[PDB]
Subunit: 455 residues, 4 copies
């Protein structure tokens, strides 16, 4: 069927039309998935390894094609798209490694052998975002397959095309190794229908959701008796102490601020800079931001592409307007061409709307402050995903690292840093559970404790 328009966020053209499943169709797919739980649960290690490795092989073989899809559909600059594709290859490969290597444990006992075994949770409901639709899908699908789960997967309608390609890739791997196709199910359509059904359905055993904090919170209220993993967003504070290497902090913060036009859960949300160096930092940072190439994601020279929709870009514009109304000083940008939003920098105080709002936009509030106020400002939000500190001081770096109420603390690089094999996630309203393949596999399985009593 051809139900739902898929849009190129740069040109605004309809790229194509895809199926939008009804709630009853979503229920049907879940019923089908349930029938294959036994097949997946019993799939040998060698078979899961082979499937995961073959998925990585196909992605590698179609790397440029997949990167182009990310550029056209997600608006992702082609150089950045290639990086995401490369990461997705790594993710499937690492899950293949862990099928073979994941360790269970033996616990000492007099006259008993006590050991653990991990078994699938059953049906994993994977709900993936528009921004890194390929690698973030890989971060749910790969550990799910690794742990013998059946999958129902709803991708974001804002950039579904790479996920459709991944589903075909998965289907090929499954066919190659004689596994029924019903073990993996891509369900496209409205989030509030298909996504909602995955969350609510009593046959689904676990929800793994990456996306907005608002939606994540709603899931906790509607999911019922299921395991729940949430990877949400935040307003990620990046702190520049008076002793920081300023050139290196600027370069790091340009990346953290403007990669994928700020549409990353760990994008820079606010910069707190010591008053003594604030003028110099601000000048250096604005000057570097000025020279970024803003435009067509398909162009090799493009640094910053469009936001995912005009509707979102319009919303960002109003937020920047509100920020200026509250006394924010515009230092760069604040301009918009349809969905193409230009790098925008303001100096604001800690009470500004931008300090409390995740904009998913290339909009950067800078707060000049004393060291004594920084931790309090950094911790002042309802979120707690990533934070960062730039300093050369051992004592200060450790004090900040301990006291920052965040799932991740980065020293001398921006909040945007994630090494794919590290445990990754947020506290407060920013998440539940940790991702990264090893960690996701642990969430996507249940422990069985086996006790053999000795005569």
């Amino acid at each position: 069927r051809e139900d739902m328009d898929v849009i190129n966020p740069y040109s605004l053209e309809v790229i194509k039309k895809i199926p939008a499943l009804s709630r009853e169709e979503a229920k049907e797919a879940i019923d089908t998935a349930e029938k294959y739980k036994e097949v997946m649960k019993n799939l040998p290690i060698t078979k899961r390894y082979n499937i995961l490795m073959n998925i990585a092989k196909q992605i590698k073989e179609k790397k440029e094609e997949l990167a182009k899809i990310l550029a056209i559909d997600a608006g992702k600059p082609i150089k950045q798209a290639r990086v995401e594709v490369e990461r997705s290859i790594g993710t499937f490969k690492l899950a293949a490694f862990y099928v073979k290597e994941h360790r269970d444990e033996v616990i000492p006992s007099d006259d008993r052998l006590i050991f653990t075994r991990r078994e699938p949770v059953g049906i994993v409901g994977a709900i993936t975002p528009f921004n890194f639709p390929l690698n973030l899908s890989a971060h749910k699908i790969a550990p799910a397959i690794a742990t013998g789960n059946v999958i129902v997967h709803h991708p974001s309608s804002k950039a579904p095309l790479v996920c459709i390609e991944l589903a075909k890739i998965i289907e090929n791997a499954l066919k190659k190794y004689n596994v029924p196709l019903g073990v993996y199910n891509l369900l496209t359509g409205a989030g509030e229908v298909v996504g909602d059904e995955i969350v609510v359905n009593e046959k689904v055993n676990m929800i793994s959701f990456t996306g907005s904090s608002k939606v994540g919170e709603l899931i906790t209220k509607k999911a019922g008796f299921k395991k729940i993993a949430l990877e949400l967003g935040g307003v990620n504070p990046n702190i520049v102490l008076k002793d920081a290497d300023l050139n290196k902090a600027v370069n790091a913060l340009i990346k953290g601020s403007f990669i994928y036009a700020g549409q990353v859960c760990i994008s820079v949300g606010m910069i707190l800079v010591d008053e003594s160096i604030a003028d110099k930092f601000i000048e250096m940072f604005v000057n570097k931001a000025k020279v970024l190439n803003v435009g067509n994601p398909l162009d090799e020279k493009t640094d910053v592409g469009p936001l995912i929709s005009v509707e979102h870009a319009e919303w960002v514009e109003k937020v920047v307007e509100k920020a200026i109304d509250e006394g924010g000083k515009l230092l760069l940008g604040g301009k918009r061409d349809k969905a193409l939003f230009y790098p925008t920098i303001l100096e604001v105080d800690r009470d500004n709307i931008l300090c409390k709002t995740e904009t998913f936009a290339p909009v950067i509030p800078i707060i000049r402050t004393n060291e004594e106020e920084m931790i309090d400002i950094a911790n002042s939000t309802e979120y707690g995903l990533h934070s960062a500190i730039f300093t050369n001081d051992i004592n200060k770096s450790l004090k900040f690292a301990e006291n920052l109420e965040f799932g991740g603390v980065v020293i001398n690089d921006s909040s945007l840093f994630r090494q794919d094999n590290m445990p990754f996630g947020g506290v407060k309203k920013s998440g539940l559970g940790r991702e990264g393949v090893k960690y996701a596999m642990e969430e996507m399985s249940n422990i069985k404790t086996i006790i053999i009593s000795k005569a």
Copy 2:
């Protein structure tokens, strides 16, 4: 200081004393207060946590016989079993002390970056504990919570709260000794549906750790909201006896599993599935051992089986036994009651019997004779998945059953009742979320922080 709620001796039915019952508004105030102490708990040094935990254990040891007597009087637990529970609780606190010092974080390899993890408290842990092992099951929530730097709001079951009140005084003594504000640990007594519910629902509580009925656990998942959730629920635990089982050993093990604490344990034997070829011999042997059990006063040293926790429960169990007999269940022993004192009761039934899908929390044992190829299916046929057991000397069959039994625990050659306190413990399906055992509970009661140091 309020005398609101009766506490009952389930053997004599006498009111032992009256304790406070907090209103919802009083529970909210207590949670608000606890919130104030999150920072002090979070920053308590390792040495201080260690010292607090060891001193709790020391105090429990000192009062061991006194605490055991309270379990007998208040929970109806035979004194020999009460002493075992107290000893376990000492171990639980000491193990938490060990882990505060020994729990390991990790380093992830990276070119030109130092990446390592750190565990931090979840914040306020809401601990809701059951009447059946109210001392050690409280220890299994409190000890790891203190170890991981959490503030605690704790609601104990009203059916046997007295030992929890004594433990609270003990914790208070330890906190005073090491100059920690008392507000870091809070015992909130009263109606489960008022105080326990408020702990579950309140937005300031960061994590719920509940042990008790499956029905209540299910409801908690719908009402908790944005919180970490650990649930230790129940089940109808199938115990499987194959053709080749050592029958003497299986009988002895299953007597314990069936009748310890009058079957009021989440991992108590809920059904026995026995091979047809040995069913007659097994059943005769099993009934004959159950016949000689001493039923009576929990304070008596020779007592094997004490009362159920309430008359109300005993009356309900009686009804279920009646219904089981209505459906064709064959009464082999017991089926008699003296107020809350319920006698060991054994029936032969088929897989469709009400007892095969009802958690009775009672000394009532359905036995199904069947064939091997049916056993896994019957075992897996409930909505629950806590513990299962198999008695066999066959390697291939033991592994087949171990893999295929849909349970959080599978016990080979001992009953479902087995739990070593330092093992990961918990259920699948409607029997739980998360694992207990101090090391595992600590992992649930903390969040990971990933720290990345970028090198030149």
Copy 3:
């Protein structure tokens, strides 16, 4: 170099395949001095570069699989189907090393006001001395973890089948060049074991010795190595136990594999079979009948099950051991025949006192002892060795009792002693070894821990 000093022999035809360099001690010393110059380069090689080199080695091996397999057949006398399996394993070993460079975990230890963490660093120069029998995968098991852990390598391969190691050395050189690493980080040193291998053992610049081969040589190494880390993978007379309740068809098939894979020239090959008296006749008949039909001949033939022993010299010696075994009262049941180095599957029934029960023959010569259960553990543990043991039984209690009481680095239940999953920790106790292999385990042997303490 380009010198043609030492004959390399095809053990089937006994023809000289070619001549290779035989390094002098002074040339070995010179090579070790070279390796020393590159310790700093290797120690600082980034993770990505180590990963890339190891994956590229696996890629090239895969691309040359059939060629490498043919070399094993011609040089080691290994039947071609078995040769392919070795090559396949070696690809996996390099790949697994690649993944552990990325995933290996260090730890963080709790401390008030201090961050304490570990860091693994290379031992420095790893001296690898590899055997003739699995020269490719056993070289992979030393080289792959060495590179992963940032060590320089000096490697002496067995002169009895050095050709595949010369090919692996070229593959290593290609990978090093591709990623701009000096070739001096890996050095293949061919020649006499007692000259070149000995220099590696004795040289004070070598930091660790990893040796796989004869127990005699391994013992010598402990006396000659001095102040170095030492890992030894030696042999044994591996006992395989068949209890009266074993699945006989399965035990026979498993034991045919364990007895006759690579003509018994494996450190974990079946050294003796102990069989319960009650089933001894049936077992022996079944085992002899399966052994009878094995195809003995040219390893290049796809049909061949059993190729030649590695030398005429060794085959002559085995023949004398068999003669002595017969002298002692051994009963010849099959074979005993020899054609140059081609030794036919040979089976004797003997008693526990026979020379075969104490002698590692590295040959297709299988002593069978009929006995009772209670004597089995004592017979099995009666040697100076302790590599692998196996037991065939369906009995849980007996399997657990034997597993605990067998004095061996490995205990295999319901498969023969020959079993080794490449990712399991592998090695021996008593005179059979020091340390464990398998990539993750070798990486630990080939690194030193650094504890770093940051005081706050």
Copy 4:
């Protein structure tokens, strides 16, 4: 033999003979090992609960005898009483930690299709423990506690320079064994000449593992004589402590005073040299000498004593000669350089990188200070044959990490001296300073062998 009075035991402060103890012949050592062999099965099969109980009871007895044991350290080892108490407290902790690891140590399961693969740790057999004079109670505990925990029989030679606390510990172990009905033959204290009794433990083919703590010279000879045994060595070094120009000087001085002068410098991780940036060298030296000046040097039984005597007059005389040589080579004496029998006073010299003190482990309160530039420091620090502990004082993130990664040592301490050891951390040296790691959990791994068990499924 228990009644024999063969060998003098000396108080290093008064030089008085405290008492005379047995010295076993090689043949008596052989017999003790033969007898220990007979109890290998008993120890190997001792239940977890029994091992736990024995370990906890040893800890309980040490705690009940704390003051007495501390006094023995003062009198026999010359250890200031305040430091003796600390050692005793650590030893209680070591036995308790072993108790918890008997219960908590984890084995692993490895994935396999249709196979259950798991590991089991089993004892090495007979552990030959050879312990030093300097921390004779806790360093004995660091070998005994893990050995018992892992089901090994023990033959234990304590240093004859301070054996009395080890005789006391042996009685304590005997009491615990008796209490829990274990034969006394599972643990054997063998006193006498190191070159007789220690040598026999090293060479005897029935001993399965050697764990030795002491001089690097003796450690090296063990590697040449042990043969086919597992070997763990905890040796010494000349431990470099580096003070960068951005260091907190007050903190560095306090930390280095402890590291330099605790137990009169007779610690394997004692400060061996201080490298200090040229730019701050004068200020640091003045502060360091001034704090060292006010240390109380005297009778270890006095509560006020900071520094007691060296373990022997022989050693003190040798140290005197080394200081003389250091001065001959151009070393500038800043403090001390004086001896009263075995009582050696805090001694500080400014020297260059080529001075004898930069290459010599003195086990004495003698501290060479070398002023240099930052870029020379790693090379000077790494220039010895040893590699136990190093330290760096700095507030700079990048520099701390650079030094931490490039210092060729088993331990690197940032902002405390080389003397730091948390008992639960893996502890040991590279180069000539060791093999293996101690710390209960780590020693348990060294003192056991892995068994891999594979259950093949149908």
